[PDB]
Amino acid sequence: PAALEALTSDQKALFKQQLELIA
Amino acid sequence: PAALEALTSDQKALFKQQLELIARYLKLDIRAGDKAYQASQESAKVLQSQLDLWLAEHGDFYASGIEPVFSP
Amino acid sequence: PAALEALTSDQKALFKQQLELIA
Structure with missing residues (x-):
């Protein structure tokens, strides 16, 4: 989950x- | 200007x-801030009405004349 | 796989x- 969380954090x-x- | 406005509108x-x-992907929304603010309008109107009712039966000389000033 | 599928679905x-x- 951490790698996903990091990628989605980069996102x-x-x-x-x-x-x-x-904006 | 219209072509620029249209392109910037497409944008x-x-x-x-x-x-x-x-924002959907990130579960985010701006409108929520306004929603909370509207609830606050209701807080304001609610409280306001009571002042009106108070003053209508008392007057400013009374209102000001009854405030506490005692201090040890 | 489901989280990847969902993200790629959001995509x-x-x-x-x-x-x-x-388009």
Whole structure:
């Protein structure tokens, strides 16, 4: 689960960033 | 300007969608903040009514004249 | 496999959407 959580966290960063960047 | 506005609108759609789609993937929502805020409007209106009712039977000279000032 | 399938499904949705949205 940790690798998935990390990848989804990398995603979360990218995405949260886009949701503050595209935003 | 219209072509730019349209492209940026296509973008806006895509992006707003992603900001609701990637956001869906991330279980996120902006509207929730407003929902909580609306409940707070109700808190405000509720409390306000009571002041109105109070004042209507008392007057400002009374209201101000009854406040505590005692301090050891 | 189910978590991978779900993530790739979230992707599939996003992507199919883009393949109908970008499209």
